[PDB]
Design a protein around this ligand. Sequence first.
Ligand SMILES: C[C+](CO)[C@H](O)COP(=O)(O)OP(=O)(O)O
Ligand SMILES: C[C+](CO)[C@H](O)COP(=O)(O)OP(=O)(O)O
Ligand code: SF4
Ligand code: SF4
Lengths: 402, 402
Amino acid sequence: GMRRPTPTVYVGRVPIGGAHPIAVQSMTNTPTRDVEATTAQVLELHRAGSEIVRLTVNDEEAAKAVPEIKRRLLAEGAEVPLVGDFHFNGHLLLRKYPKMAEALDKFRINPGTLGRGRHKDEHFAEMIRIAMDLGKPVRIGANWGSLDPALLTELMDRNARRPEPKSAHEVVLEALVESAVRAYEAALEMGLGEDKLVLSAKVSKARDLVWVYRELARRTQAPLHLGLTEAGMGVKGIVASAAALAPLLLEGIGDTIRVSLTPAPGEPRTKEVEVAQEILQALGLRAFAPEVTSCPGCGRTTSTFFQELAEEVSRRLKERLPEWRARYPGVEELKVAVMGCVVNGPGESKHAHIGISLPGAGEEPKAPVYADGKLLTILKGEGIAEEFLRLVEDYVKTRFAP
Amino acid sequence: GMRRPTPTVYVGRVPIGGAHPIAVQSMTNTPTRDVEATTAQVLELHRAGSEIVRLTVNDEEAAKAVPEIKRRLLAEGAEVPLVGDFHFNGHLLLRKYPKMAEALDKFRINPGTLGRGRHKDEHFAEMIRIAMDLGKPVRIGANWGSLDPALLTELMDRNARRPEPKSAHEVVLEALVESAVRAYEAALEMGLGEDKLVLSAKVSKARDLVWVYRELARRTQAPLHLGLTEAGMGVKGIVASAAALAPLLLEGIGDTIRVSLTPAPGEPRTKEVEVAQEILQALGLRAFAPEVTSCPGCGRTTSTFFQELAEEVSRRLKERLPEWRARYPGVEELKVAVMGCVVNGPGESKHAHIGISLPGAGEEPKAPVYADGKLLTILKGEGIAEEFLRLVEDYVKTRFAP
Ligand SMILES: C[C+](CO)[C@H](O)COP(=O)(O)OP(=O)(O)O
Ligand SMILES: C[C+](CO)[C@H](O)COP(=O)(O)OP(=O)(O)O
Ligand code: SF4
Ligand code: SF4
């Protein structure tokens, strides 16, 4: 289950591929024609951790805005790469607005939103030609919400000739993979470099996504852009996204990710970037920020004190991070434990860089603190929380000193 | 990647094993001695979907309370099975309080919290004897927060003799597996039935959990209780839990799950049960409630109207569910789509049972609705939301009629 080798594709300054960290990306939801709102959100997403940012380029007004958005970003020294998302008229917009084409750092094509049969091949070829002329990379991104219907008919007739035809659902997933593979092969044949081609083939159900990506990974050599499309709102969207991605990421499949959450009204667009980072950090693939390991608490602990302490520690680590990031290289790998009682508290604290085990039911009112697998001190009284946070600050300064 | 066969273990009326749905469980956080608070929370957890509920049985006052909690549950016709969580003094509490022993529906033993070496074997044997005498099932639950240190030394010396010794971390994971396996074999040898034994071996990091469970699954025949221990707070705990479980569940490993979230202060203990259900539903393993598939929205849609509609649909489905569950068998499998524009909106809506595709940028102000893969109607004007919800109600009545 080691990382799938792939050629490197640069999206701006960010390399994508088997030799590189899995890159977090996101997409804006502001109208792209609104230069102020869109530039602000691109910066917001980038500051949250979005290494690459996509924006829809849906019409001429959007196309006209892109060079000004890019100008404004550069003016503040924000080197975030921009992906243009094209559907239906990508070939017209790229042809008509060469300054937009040049301002983007990558073009997204969807093989199912090119046009009707004869025109499809030529629309696709025009986009690919422009990308080659400008040295831009392309994502060929299929999505089962926009599956090429002629290809689906071809595969439905192939399936019908089988001694045991597969289900309609299965054929749809075959067709999605085929859509991406065919387009990938067509681009290569036209001369686009392996260093300029990323593929995706998204579906909205986890088990299907796994199947699809295993097929992509086997059939192609490209870096893969992995995501569960239309994952939805709230806890459902978070859970579905994690569930879908983890099996693939653990098998070494995927070179960049996007988490497709529906924000609740008033919820920041940066939530999807947090989720993406948590997925990669949970699986030990990247480290972005200190993490807190804590027990659920049970009838052995005093629920509110323990929950308050864990919350307070997490809050403080988040407040310290900007400073820590600047002073203490490697601090993103910090593991801190906050535990409710003696059953697992010392042991889990010993597995962390530093951890505290509160006293639970039946225990003397003292809280041992462990660091690097051994007892550091024992805390008691009021301000356990502030004392522990001081010990954590001390530990960081020593362990992650430059 | 089909379901691992296992013998069936009944926990109360709930069967656990390869022939049965993966059971959702949880654990209380109230002091077990508080009969009113604990009974209330057991009912709350059970009504949220916890098919089995664990409670700590840490001391004599807790032990004395258990038969009254069980009485109170039965008095309201709540047949929820109770698992007693025992550490350090399990053998003393079960011996001293036979009415507690009989009131429980399953005993949890942790091989690392039995006692010191010589006494450990006898403590374990006493618990197992009582379980056999009463016909109770047992979980032998190892946890790396409470790993038997003598076993770890034995395995550290075995490792040191290897031509290429493994890391200390790797040896810890070996020891955790060995702890569970040895105890399982010991229980079987003493005469406890294969129909009375569930195993777990929990760690707090996802990739390690996968390794551990693949080993358990191979080395034993028991049903497995799967969970990422000490998963933590908030989005991190949710994501880590999903990430850890999905690879295993998709490979067919795991017969019951528990999600080990730390509640934020004032957050209900039922959140962990929601998360558990979302994991299983995301992976197509169980269906608990209708789900909404929605796009993230982008610069093609009007952010707030779309986000409000998706939120409103999700809210309404949740309000209708108790009634629907009673009237319309199978409704838990309902899939509804709410989509932002024409790019993926119709296609994704066609994959749902019923879905709506709002008009995005450039489009006529009309919203097609699809059901069973084909156009049902087209909505326009105000009250699109109420009209769509009426269509969904109509669709449910027809499709899931008894
Ligand atoms: C932006 C858009 C056009 O496909 C989609 O509806 C959803 O975004 P997504 O889930 O990131 O999927 P794509 O990579 O865009 O296929
Ligand atoms: C309740 C308790 C005693 O092990 C733990 O700290 C945590 O609960 P858990 O994460 O469900 O892990 P166990 O199944 O109890 O090993
Ligand atoms: S460490 Fe103690 S308080 Fe925390 S859930 Fe475990 S047993 Fe309960
Ligand atoms: S369906 Fe349309 S509005 Fe929704 S994210 Fe996709 S492209 Fe954007």
